[PDB]
Amino acid sequence: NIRKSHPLMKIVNNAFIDLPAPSNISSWWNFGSLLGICLILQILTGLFLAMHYTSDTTTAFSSVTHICRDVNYGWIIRYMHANGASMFFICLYMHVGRGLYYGSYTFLETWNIGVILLLTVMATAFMGYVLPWGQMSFWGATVITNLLSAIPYIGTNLVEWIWGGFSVDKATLTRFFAFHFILPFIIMAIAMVHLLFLHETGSNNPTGISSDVDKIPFHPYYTIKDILGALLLILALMLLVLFAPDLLGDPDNYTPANPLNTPPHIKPEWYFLFAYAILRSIPNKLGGVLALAFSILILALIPLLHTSKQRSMMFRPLSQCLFWALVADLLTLTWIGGQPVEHPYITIGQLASVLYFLLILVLMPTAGTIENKLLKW
Amino acid sequence: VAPTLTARLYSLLFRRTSTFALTIVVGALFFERAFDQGADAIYEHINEGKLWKHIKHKYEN
Amino acid sequence: VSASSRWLEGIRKWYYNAAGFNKLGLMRDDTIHENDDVKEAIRRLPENLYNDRVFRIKRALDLSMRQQILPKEQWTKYEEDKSYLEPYLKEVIRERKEREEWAKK
Amino acid sequence: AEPEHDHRKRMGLKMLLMMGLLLPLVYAMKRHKWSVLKSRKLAYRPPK
Amino acid sequence: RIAEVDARVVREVCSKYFYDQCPAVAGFGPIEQLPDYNRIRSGMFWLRF
Amino acid sequence: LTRFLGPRYRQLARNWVPTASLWGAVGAVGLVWATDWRLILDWVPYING
Amino acid sequence: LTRFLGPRYRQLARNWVPTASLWGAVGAVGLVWATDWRLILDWVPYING
Ligand SMILES: CCCCCCCCCCCCCCCC(=O)OC[C@H](COP(=O)(O)OCCN)OC(=O)CCCCCCCCCCCCCCC
Ligand SMILES: CCCCCCCCCCCCCCCCCC(=O)OC[C@H](COP(=O)(O)OCCN)OC(=O)CCCCCCCCCCCCC
Ligand SMILES: CCCCCCCCCCCCCC(=O)OC[C@H](COP(=O)(O)OCC[N+](C)(C)C)OC(=O)CCCCCCCCCCCCC
Ligand SMILES: CCCCCCCCCCCCCC(=O)OC[C@H](COP(=O)(O)OCC[N+](C)(C)C)OC(=O)CCCCCCCCCCCCC
Ligand code: HEM
Ligand code: HEM
Ligand SMILES: C[C@@]1(c2ccc(Oc3ccccc3)nc2)OC(=O)N(Nc2ccccc2)C1=O
Ligand SMILES: CCCCCC(=O)OC[C@H](COP(=O)([O-])OCCN)OC(=O)CCCCC
Ligand SMILES: CCCCCC(=O)OC[C@H](COP(=O)([O-])OCCN)OC(=O)CCCCC
Ligand SMILES: CCCCCC(=O)OC[C@H](COP(=O)([O-])OCCN)OC(=O)CCCCC
Ligand SMILES: [Cl-]
Structure with a gap:
């Protein structure tokens, strides 16, 4: 009873112990806590990397090597932080894909707060990749920051204002380090408002049917299920860190930055390849930059495109096929994103980009309406 | 050993939480010594020639 | 009216079994x-x-937890699915539209 | 280029062995608690 | 037999039948707030002891 | 705060002194183990390595 | 979301169009003022300095 009355523990009790939760939430509901585990992992590893990092352009590259060579277990902390960022995006896309399949977006405040969390984590990881100051770090900063130049009539001012100069330089790296430090703490705060709005309604479940008739307490059922999932997250992370720490990185990033020469085979991190592919399928400068932004911001429109009288796709075969056509289409854009801009990849990437927006805007809402008519309602 | 092994472990060590914790902290102590000892002996057997401590005899001084 | 009607109803019965909520003992309105x-x-x-x-939904959530379905004998037959909620819902919608039409003048 | 090579491989071996222990034990703790629910039986007896 | 009983006898006798034992529970009525069996079972021991 | 001086309170302390003694062994062994305290561990038989 | 198309809703919009027009002047002047927008401020008489 003292868990319930103390002003501080009552918040913990009503969120992790006595919280009524559905009895049937699958493994796809584990990624919520794993996103928090990832956020806490990145803060700890990242904080210990800032104790031995310098944001000077002339020593930023060398300070990272100093970590991986001379700092006691500095390398393992370093590669946990890098691979932890990739694990962060694995969990994000599964968390999002879970909500799309099972209709969890109908929690508008929770969903929309979610879209904000996705964008800030994207901004955080982009700036993080600029810090080691390799070749891909510099030219990654060059390409993505120049996207603002597409904004008419103020673009170059926004770009040069952000750069602190006429190009990416020492002033740009020092501030990206300050942003990369602080932005995770804002994310943690926004993640609490994410959970605040969620608890108003409680969780959805795989059936999309209300579960108030069958609820179980979060403890001990989902404390131990979340503990098991965390051990599997650590397994996935430590396999990368301890057996393949460079598999997800680019070798050119181990050469210091050089503003005078760009590598020929630009390849971003795997978690940006699908959207990189969308942008270059449009040769117009402003058009391709808007398509990039809309490929992510379209998530805010998914609640308005829900046509089915059922919430979850568990009982919607036609929507299921279109859902998996979107995953395979996103897998195609990721593949095209990792290949050079040449025949036939240019045309494949154009067709996949059209299919991506065609599925979300046209096909999937029409499938939900066909399904309603098939059930005669 | 007429009583079950797991049965005698429970009555003596697991019934009280205090002795249930003492068996864990004492177990982690003896587990750490034996696990690192056996793990290192396996990593060294696969790599018997390759390691430095397998070549330190050449360089006496 | 058997020729064209039964083919449409045949496709609806196909979709009903494909939806699979009958495999958990549920009805459409559930x-x-x-x-x-x-x-x-x-x-x-x-x-x-x-x-x-309440009990059908509770039984289905229990199945969904166990990743199971009912035996085939206990599946909700397409012809026996009762739209028990539709007439109430139709009236509730009709009442809301009346309010909305009064809110326009 | 990778002086930590040998040490990382030794750690990788220890990580695999501990996971091979902890994964089935933690899995067993999950099923132990959940068994209350997984074997629960329901019955509906409304008045007529 | 009653006079033989002192505080030690109650602590020993009660621990023999109550402490860390599986109870049988029976609920009837508006019992949505009836705690889960695991939580009831966890109520049969003290982590502090 | 004199109210805790009485026969019941000294019977209560006597019931909990075996438990608190053991939680001291947990913390002592836990501190020695977590810090690799050489001053104490040199005396343990098998640990010596 | 057709329910907002009616005589009452178009009387309501007509009552609030003078207010929304003025809040556009507040934001427009506020944007020009906060950014020192030379494109517009060159035309204002006394501001020219
Ligand atoms: C202030 C502290 C902040 C800590 C924040 C950490 C964040 C959590 C990160 C999770 C890392 C997973 C374990 C890395 C193992 C390693 O790397 O250890 C390498 C060591 C060998 O090392 P050695 O060969 O030098 O011999 C050592 C000298 N005697 O054996 C291991 O593999 C042990 C790991 C077993 C497998 C993983 C099991 C995961 C359990 C989760 C426990 C997490 C604790 C949480 C702490 C906050
Ligand atoms: C954004 C950029 C992404 C770039 C990376 C793209 C790479 C994609 C690689 C493919 C990933 C495949 C993941 C594994 C999917 C397994 C699907 C499965 O197990 O079967 C379908 C399952 C059926 O389960 P029901 O809940 O319908 O009923 C169960 C009743 N027994 O139903 C489910 O379990 C569906 C649950 C939702 C799956 C989430 C996958 C989402 C993939 C990312 C989406 C990104 C959206 C932006
Ligand atoms: C100076 C240094 C001091 C440190 C010294 C070392 C101390 C070691 C811990 C000793 C305390 C152990 C007490 C304990 O186990 O109780 C807590 C729960 C309950 O155990 P349980 O078996 O469920 O019931 C206990 C009943 N009993 C006592 C009568 C048998 O038991 C548990 O649940 C504990 C095991 C769960 C592990 C998972 C939780 C850890 C966080 C997750 C990390 C992995 C995922 C990232
Ligand atoms: C793109 C750029 C766009 C920016 C353009 C500039 C916009 C300027 C603001 C215009 C909005 C003014 C509206 C307003 O004043 O209302 C808020 C309150 C209420 O005023 P009040 O006189 O109390 O009652 C209003 C009644 N009325 C309208 C019938 C006369 O009035 C106030 O309380 C406002 C004055 C209080 C100032 C103190 C609060 C600021 C934070 C404290 C900072 C100093 C301490 C660190
Ligand atoms: C830092 C990033 C995020 C964290 C830490 C986080 C955390 C969580 C947690 C703990 C839950 C409850 C447990 C669960 O359902 O697994 C949850 C639920 C949810 N999240 Fe997030 N989330 C994040 C980002 C997002 C994003 C980007 C979206 C969507 C665009 C989103 C949408 C949702 C929805 C719809 C639910 C409710 C799911 C349900 O009830 O079935 N979240 N989130
Ligand atoms: C959501 C949280 C975070 C994410 C996703 C993230 C992601 C990243 C990524 C992808 C890199 C590039 C690593 C590389 O190329 O080697 C990086 C580097 C870095 N991060 Fe973070 N980070 C996060 C939080 C933090 C925090 C909180 C700190 C400090 C308190 C931090 C400090 C650093 C430092 C110093 C580096 C440069 C060293 C290096 O390149 O390994 N990060 N981060
Ligand atoms: C890590 C990374 C990044 C991080 C985050 C990030 O967000 C998003 C992820 C998904 C969708 C939208 C945004 N998009 C790139 O930052 C960086 O410079 N590159 N590579 C690079 C090289 C050349 C051009 C562009 C990018 C990355 O892949
Ligand atoms: C330093 C450890 C402090 C103690 C924390 C702890 O063990 O939590 C208590 C529960 C088990 O106790 P109970 O739920 O049986 O209730 C018993 C009450 N008589 O354990 C869990 O499963 C919760 C998961 C906590 C992981 C962080
Ligand atoms: C409160 C933080 C304590 C951390 C102190 C510390 O760094 O511990 C190092 C010593 C090492 O054991 P030693 O035999 O080398 O002895 C070397 C003596 N310098 O281990 C200890 O002595 C741990 C003592 C714990 C007391 C609370
Ligand atoms: C949304 C952030 C906008 C910030 C853009 C900016 O840096 O503003 C600079 C210009 C300066 O006015 P100008 O006459 O020099 O014109 C110089 C043209 N480069 O002021 C503006 O034009 C403000 C325009 C506001 C539109 C929202
Ligand atoms: Cl480097």
Whole structure:
């Protein structure tokens, strides 16, 4: 009873112990806590990397090597932080894909707060990749920051204002380090408002049917299920860190930055390849930059495109096929994103980009309406 | 050993939480010594020639 | 009217089994998404239909937890699916549209 | 280029062995608690 | 037999039948707040002891 | 705060002194183990390595 | 979302169009003022300095 009355523990009790939760939430509901585990992992590893990092352009590259060579277990902390960022995006896309399949977006405040969390984590990881100051770090900063130049009539001012100069330089790296430090703490705060709005309604479940008739307490059922999932997250992370720490990185990033020469085979991190592919399928400068932004911001429109009288796709075969056509289409854009801009990849990437927006805007809402008519309602 | 092994472990060590914790902290102590000892002996057997401590005899001084 | 009607109904029965909510003992109206119109219609259900709706959903959530389905004998037959909630929901919608039409003048 | 090579491989071996222990034990703790629910039986007895 | 009983006898006798034992529970009525069996079972021991 | 000086309170302390003694062994062994305290561990038989 | 198309709703919009027009002047002047927008401020008489 003292868990319930103390002003501080009552918040913990009503969120992790006595919280009524559905009895049937699958493994796809584990990624919520794993996103928090990832956020806490990145803060700890990242904080210990800032104790031995310098944001000077002339020593930023060398300070990272100093970590991986001379700092006691500095390398393992370093590669946990890098691979932890990739694990962060694995969990994000599964968390999002879970909500799309099972209709969890109908929690508008929770969903929309979610879209904000996705964008800030994207901004955080982009700036993080600029810090080691390799070749891909510099030219990654060059390409993505120049996207603002597409904004008419103020673009170059926004770009040069952000750069602190006429190009990416020492002033740009020092501030990206300050942003990369602080932005995770804002994310943690926004993640609490994410959970605040969620608890108003409680969780959805795989059936999309209300579960108030069958609820179980979060403890001990989902404390131990979340503990098991965390051990599997650590397994996935430590396999990368301890057996393949460079598999997800680019070798050119181990050469210091050089503003005078760009590598020929630009390849971003795997978690940006699908959207990189969308942008270059449009040769117009402003058009391709808007398509990039809309490929992510379209998530805010998914609640308005829900046509089915059922919430979850568990009982919607036609929507299921279109859902998996979107995953395979996103897998195609990721593949095209990792290949050079040449025949036939240019045309494949154009067709996949059209299919991506065609599925979300046209096909999937029409499938939900066909399904309603098939059930005669 | 007429009583079950797991049965005698429970009555003596697991019934009280205090002795249930003492068996864990004492177990982690003896587990750490034996696990690192056996793990290192396996990593060294696969790599018997390759390691430095397998070549330190050449360089006496 | 058997020729063209039964082919449409044949495709509906195909989809009904493909949807698979009958495999958990559920009926169609048990799966509808609860918006404000649906909460009121459920509120208006008589005692027996409400209690039956509760147990079927409870039985399906229990199955979904165990990743199981009912034996094939206990599946909801397409011809025996009763749209017990539809008439209440139709009235609730008709009442809301009346309010909205009065709110326009 | 990778002086930590040998040490990382030794750690990788220890990580695999501990996971091979902890994964089935933690899995067993999950099923132990959940068994209350997984074997629960329901019955509906409304008045007629 | 009653006079033989002192505080030690109650602590020993009660621990023999209550402490860390599986109870049988029976609930009837508006029992949505009836705690889960695992939580009831966890109530049969003290982590502090 | 004199109210805790009485026969019941000294019977209560006597019931909990075996438990608190053991939680001291947990913390002592836990501190020695977590810090690799050489001053104490040199005396343990098998640990010596 | 057709329910907002009616005589009452178009009387309501007509009552609030003078207010929304003025809040556009507040934001427009506020944007020009906060950014020192030379494109517009060159035309204002006394501001020219
Ligand atoms: C202030 C502290 C902040 C800590 C924040 C950490 C964040 C959590 C990160 C999770 C890392 C997973 C374990 C890395 C193992 C390693 O790397 O250890 C390498 C060591 C060998 O090392 P050695 O060969 O030098 O011999 C050592 C000298 N005697 O054996 C291991 O593999 C042990 C790991 C077993 C497998 C993983 C099991 C995961 C359990 C989760 C426990 C997490 C604790 C949480 C702490 C906050
Ligand atoms: C954004 C950029 C992404 C770039 C990376 C793209 C790479 C994609 C690689 C493919 C990933 C495949 C993941 C594994 C999917 C397994 C699907 C499965 O197990 O079967 C379908 C399952 C059926 O389960 P029901 O809940 O319908 O009923 C169960 C009743 N027994 O139903 C489910 O379990 C569906 C649950 C939702 C799956 C989430 C996958 C989402 C993939 C990312 C989406 C990104 C959206 C932006
Ligand atoms: C100076 C240094 C001091 C440190 C010294 C070392 C101390 C070691 C811990 C000793 C305390 C152990 C007490 C304990 O186990 O109780 C807590 C729960 C309950 O155990 P349980 O078996 O469920 O019931 C206990 C009943 N009993 C006592 C009568 C048998 O038991 C548990 O649940 C504990 C095991 C769960 C592990 C998972 C939780 C850890 C966080 C997750 C990390 C992995 C995922 C990232
Ligand atoms: C793109 C750029 C766009 C920016 C353009 C500039 C916009 C300027 C603001 C215009 C909005 C003014 C509206 C307003 O004043 O209302 C808020 C309150 C209420 O005023 P009040 O006189 O109390 O009652 C209003 C009644 N009325 C309208 C019938 C006369 O009035 C106030 O309280 C406002 C004055 C209080 C100032 C103190 C609060 C600021 C934070 C404290 C900073 C100093 C301490 C660190
Ligand atoms: C830092 C990033 C995020 C964290 C830490 C986080 C955390 C969580 C947690 C703990 C839950 C409850 C447990 C669960 O469902 O697994 C949850 C639920 C949810 N999240 Fe997030 N989330 C994040 C980002 C997002 C994003 C980007 C979206 C969507 C665009 C989103 C949408 C949702 C939805 C719809 C639910 C409710 C799911 C349900 O009830 O079935 N979240 N989130
Ligand atoms: C959501 C949280 C975070 C994410 C996703 C993230 C992601 C990243 C990524 C992808 C890199 C590039 C690593 C590389 O190329 O080697 C990086 C580097 C870095 N991060 Fe973070 N980070 C996060 C939080 C933090 C925090 C909180 C700190 C400090 C308190 C931090 C400090 C650093 C430092 C110093 C580096 C440069 C060293 C290096 O390149 O390994 N990060 N981060
Ligand atoms: C890590 C990374 C990044 C991080 C985050 C990030 O967000 C998003 C992820 C998904 C969708 C939208 C945004 N998009 C790139 O930052 C960086 O410079 N590159 N590579 C690079 C090289 C050349 C051009 C562009 C990018 C990355 O892949
Ligand atoms: C330093 C450890 C402090 C103690 C924390 C702890 O063990 O939590 C208590 C529960 C088990 O106790 P109970 O749920 O049986 O209730 C028993 C009450 N008589 O354990 C869990 O499963 C919770 C998961 C906590 C992981 C962080
Ligand atoms: C409160 C933080 C304590 C951390 C102190 C510390 O760094 O511990 C190092 C010593 C090492 O054991 P030693 O035999 O080398 O002895 C070397 C003596 N310098 O281990 C200890 O002595 C741990 C003592 C714990 C007391 C609370
Ligand atoms: C949304 C952030 C906008 C910030 C853009 C900016 O840096 O503003 C600079 C210009 C300066 O006015 P100008 O006459 O020099 O014109 C110089 C043109 N480069 O002021 C503006 O034009 C403000 C325009 C506001 C539109 C929202
Ligand atoms: Cl480097």
